[PDB]
């Protein structure tokens, strides 16, 4: 309807993480029916990041989904209004990462802007120190509550041989009336974020592949 | 070999939830291969339980899991000798679950014990008002931590259209020497966990399914 097979996005972003300011640009495109996105992202206020942007990548896309077994698509319903999420991460060594993010439709492009807060971050732990390496894969758990969608995920951080847990909490709130949308039921949603490639804390480029769909087991 | 196709259980739990002492027997069965397994509970002290069993019910068997694509089995491969593992479950309206257990194996039984603490549910919640109809399935974080397996996880219980989260946090533990095993990496497993039958907050049958995998998605 509104959405096409090749869809440009541009993201402003802007944050302090443990009292750093920053902002960063992005530009990417994607696949909203296969669920397929890039973008590149340019830091143009507080480069050099003292801290791994792995922390701000998942504030980087929820109508690139692909939805399997005919689990509606709240996001993709939500055009022309767009939407917005609200997110809180935890991290099991202390630090928590809060953002808001409004989700925009013009044309041909997706307009993001995303507002970013985190504290009490460990000085010497590894987002602080920039020594993650990204995301594994993960499952986000996505349920409605009253017409706003939630979601509840379990992340690990990749440090070696070693991975740091952070817990999220999601509100996905669509500016459509309610009444002119369907819900969907509980169902998952797995993401592959990668960050195939990053400069001088400065430059970072993102792939993100998403998948909704129920449990594959089999219920008895 | 020291596991066959068809497997017997033997469980004894002892716990005090909201200060109400129980205890309870199980006799199970199952295909740890297959990874599906059955379960006979009986609360012997302190029946009927004034809560839903259904925080109990993951308390009650981590080698009846399907391992797909060569994922080493920390389960299994720990016998003769067996294992252990310790679980914090937090309920997002403040309810905590806790429960150490140890599993054994004689003969053609793995033998189960059980000891289960719980604190601070609302009275008012389904949990205290009994009024839960089971869990969603779920998909956990497995990861090696030293030799020691971690797990977390997001689950749901179902009280009627409306969904209480909770938040595991699990650890096994190999009395197996550390060189004679093979740890996997990080993966997950899917779990649905259901109770079949109850009967006077006394009774329960429980069914559960478990895979161990790696994403679905494909990685770019």
Redesign the interface.
């Known amino acids: 309807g509104l959405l096409k097979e090749s869809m440009r996005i541009k993201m402003d972003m802007e944050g302090t993480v443990n009292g750093h300011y920053f902002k960063c640009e992005g530009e990417g495109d994607g696949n909203p029916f296969t669920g397929t996105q890039s973008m590149r992202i340019h830091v143009t206020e507080g480069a050099p990041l003292p801290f791994a942007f792995d922390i701000l990548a998942p504030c980087c896309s929820r109508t690139f989904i692909h939805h399997t077994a005919g689990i509606p698509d709240f996001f993709k319903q939500s055009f022309p209004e767009g939407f917005t999420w609200e997110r809180t991460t935890t991290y099991e060594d202390g630090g928590i990462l809060t953002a808001h993010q409004d989700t925009s439709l013009e044309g041909n492009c997706l307009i993001y802007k995303v507002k970013v807060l985190g504290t009490n971050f460990p000085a010497d732990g590894p987002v602080m120190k920039n020594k993650s390496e990204g995301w594994?894969?993960?499952?986000e758990?996505v349920?409605p509550?009253n017409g706003v969608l939630c979601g509840?995920?379990?992340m690990?951080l990749k440090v070696g041989?070693?991975?740091l847990?952070c817990?999220l909490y999601s509100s996905y709130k669509s500016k459509k009336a309610i009444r002119a949308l369907t819900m969907p039921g509980?169902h998952?949603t797995?993401?592959?974020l990668?960050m195939?490639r990053k400069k001088k804390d400065e430059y970072f480029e993102l792939?993100e592949?998403s998948?909704a769909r129920y449990?594959?087991?089999?219920?008895?």
């Open positions: 594994e894969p993960c499952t758990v349920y509550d509840r995920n379990v690990a041989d070693r991975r847990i817990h509980f998952f797995d993401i592959r990668q195939p792939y592949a998948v449990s594959d087991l089999p219920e008895k």
